[PDB]
Amino acid sequence: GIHVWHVPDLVSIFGDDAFFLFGGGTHGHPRGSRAGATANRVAVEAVVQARNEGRDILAEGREILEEAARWCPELREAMELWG
Amino acid sequence: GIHVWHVPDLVSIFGDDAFFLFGGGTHGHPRGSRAGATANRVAVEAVVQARNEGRDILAEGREILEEAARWCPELREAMELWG
Ligand SMILES: O=C(O)[C@@](O)(COP(=O)(O)O)[C@H](O)[C@H](O)COP(=O)(O)O
Ligand SMILES: O=C(O)[C@@](O)(COP(=O)(O)O)[C@H](O)[C@H](O)COP(=O)(O)O
């Protein structure tokens, strides 16, 4: 039962050599599966980029996700729906 | 100085044989011009189609635009920002 909000913690644990499966976190998006997949893809790619830039993921996950939703609506709707 | 909110009034006054120019209503979108041009395009087609459906425009413009924004992310931002 993972969604966009769990992306920063997941990247902290598993690094880059792992699979993240969003069963209900993709199809549960308020605008279908295409938006849900884009939201998760944007969330992961944004958190990884910040980690590669030296930011502290565990502490700045919320800020990274907000900054990415600031330019991606699909992630914005995903976050405001869950958690 | 016309934005998405004025589309129900513009379509009612002018009909379908006219040009609508969104100069500052396209580039003033909180996410650029390509996002702004989509919100203007979706708003017009939603109002025009709902007029071909027989629904009243001058009274149900707000509702029509809200149903359009429910599935268009670009239109939702434009309606939130202006008015
Ligand atoms: O069957 C399910 O629920 C899932 O498809 C999750 O889909 P959602 O993402 O929609 O919950 C997973 O296969 C199980 O959770 C496996 O968990 P484990 O890896 O512990 O076996
Ligand atoms: O200069 C401007 O304001 C515009 O570029 C509109 O920009 P916005 O769309 O940002 O207002 C138009 O040329 C004038 O409004 C013309 O108005 P008229 O058609 O009455 O000459």
Side-chain angles (χ1 to χ4, degrees), chain A residues 1-2 21-25:
Chain A
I2 54 168
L21 305 192
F22 305 98

Side-chain angles (χ1 to χ4, degrees), chain A residues 16-77:
Chain A
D16 296 18
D17 297 337
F19 264 87
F20 298 147
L21 305 192
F22 305 98
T26 300
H27 295 89
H29 195 276
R31 262 200 294 116
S33 311
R34 186 172 301 199
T38 305
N40 308 157
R41 171 86 165 245
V42 165
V44 166
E45 283 210 334
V47 169
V48 169
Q49 170 168 349
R51 187 212 48 176
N52 282 351
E53 279 182 341
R55 299 168 79 174
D56 188 294
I57 291 312
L58 285 87
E60 295 193 28
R62 202 163 310 239
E63 285 64 42
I64 293 153
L65 289 199
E66 290 169 4
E67 173 188 26
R70 182 179 63 83
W71 58 253
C72 199
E74 277 77 17
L75 174 55
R76 192 179 326 152
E77 301 182 76

